[PDB]
Design a binder for this molecule. Structure first.
Ligand SMILES: NCc1c[nH]c2nc(N)[nH]c(=O)c12
Ligand SMILES: NCc1c[nH]c2nc(N)[nH]c(=O)c12
Lengths: 254, 258
């Protein structure tokens, strides 16, 4: 099967946001950064081309794009001849923007651009090394109740323990300014996502809205980077004060 | 549920090797390097642990391990408490060696070991940049016929254009590095040959062996190494290494698409 933009499946963002009981206007801004590790097509002469794509979808887009459908859409490029790399990037912008409902940004880079590019970790302190027992993996947001009692602080915390539903795996970076967060509670909360079902996008939005309503920080940023499924990974960034992360560099599991 | 070694499914190497007309005594030595990006389990206290696994399976093993079973087997660790990372590494070795049929080597690394680790590309000259037309995608090994007419040389070549499917599937993507000492290979022929794999259905390990045996039969190098690095599926990638003279690749460093 060749190029087929109708393979893309929009999912209205409002659908699962309704269950976060949001306000009229969004409490956050941000974007979903997708890495397309498998991007490949044929040039005009039938010679395969390979590239890595990077896509940025604004969090204000009416829809997100269902990842399997994104994967299938990309696969439809595989056996398709395009006259150039510019054409490929342009069609990607067109189709993805059409689907999302807002202009999407797309970078199509040759593999060579990645040579020597670092695997990175996240900012701040990892909260994952704690001596605690967890017997119960059921999602409990109330785990955050009275979570930030501390001194007013600006800090960045991260965790590699985000898991969801076969399993999805992710790391999450939480930067905030407010009463200092209890690290055990935060860890327990994050771990409680383990058995639970939502899109990565929806999960980041849940974590943001839960932290905001329980811990009431002055400013908050929640940024997760998930390992790829079907050659694509999703990296939702949601912030009270900030538009996007500085770069797309991959983490160890990605 | 809980840790379950029975999920592992071996696939005998003999299947494809018979297909490639090999005897019990192999033209090559080597191993299959797997990277396990998703390895996770619970510590004794129920706190999730995450690691990247690195598994080397000797090419002399009776069996390979079917990737999906391997993934499912690994998932069974997710909700299981293990006493230590040491116990995890031990269980992996024991179970994977039993499935493969020979002692497998396993390294379980913390995520932190990868910080600042650079992405690498393969060695030598990329053959991918050629202005040529591909008329059809059917696998053709005869594309290598008369492919090394050149003066005697030692060189390393690579291509990012390896693609494959399998009956069990969704395309697989890979890069392949070929180092040889022999009559110099025509790069157009080699590139075409590799591209002709696009619609091919076989496992990564089988592909690499096919490429090695094809190059050996058609190009008759004095020594040959074929090393492919494939993108992951289900959290696992396979990097088969096959050489006349060498037992293993120098490292597991990941490539752009991996
Ligand atoms: N992770 C499950 C999943 C399936 N399809 C998806 N599409 C998007 N955009 N995000 C997701 O998290 C998923
Ligand atoms: N990629 C196809 C595939 C499915 N299962 C597999 N198991 C192994 N060992 N190798 C493979 O290439 C595959």
């Amino acid at each position: 099967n060749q190029y087929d933009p109708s393979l893309l499946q929009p999912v209205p963002r409002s659908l699962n946001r309704n269950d976060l009981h949001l306000s009229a206007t969004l409490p956050f801004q941000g974007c979903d950064i997708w890495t397309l590790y498998e991007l490949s097509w044929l040039n005009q002469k039938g010679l395969p081309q390979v590239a890595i794509g990077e896509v940025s979808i604004p969090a204000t887009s009416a829809n997100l794009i269902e990842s399997k459908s994104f994967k299938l859409y990309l696969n439809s490029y595989n056996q398709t001849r395009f006259a150039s790399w510019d054409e490929v990037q342009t069609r990607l912008v067109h189709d993805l923007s059409a689907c999302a409902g807002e202009t999407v940004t797309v970078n199509v880079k040759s593999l060579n651009e990645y040579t020597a590019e670092p695997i990175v970790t996240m900012q701040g302190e990892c909260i994952d090394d704690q001596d605690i027992e967890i017997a119960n993996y059921e999602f409990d947001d109330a785990l955050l109740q009275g979570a930030a009692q501390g001194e007013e602080v600006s800090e960045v915390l991260h965790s590699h323990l985000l898991k969801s539903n076969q399993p999805d795996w992710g790391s999450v970076e939480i930067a905030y300014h407010g009463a200092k967060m209890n690290r055990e509670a935060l860890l327990r909360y994050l771990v409680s996502f383990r058995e639970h079902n939502e899109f990565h996008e929806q999960c980041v939005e849940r974590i943001f809205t839960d932290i905001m309503r329980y811990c009431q920080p002055q400013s908050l940023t929640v940024y997760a980077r998930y390992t790829r499924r079907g050659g694509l990974d999703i990296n939702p960034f949601r912030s009270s004060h900030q538009s996007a992360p500085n770069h797309n560099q991959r983490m160890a599991r990605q």
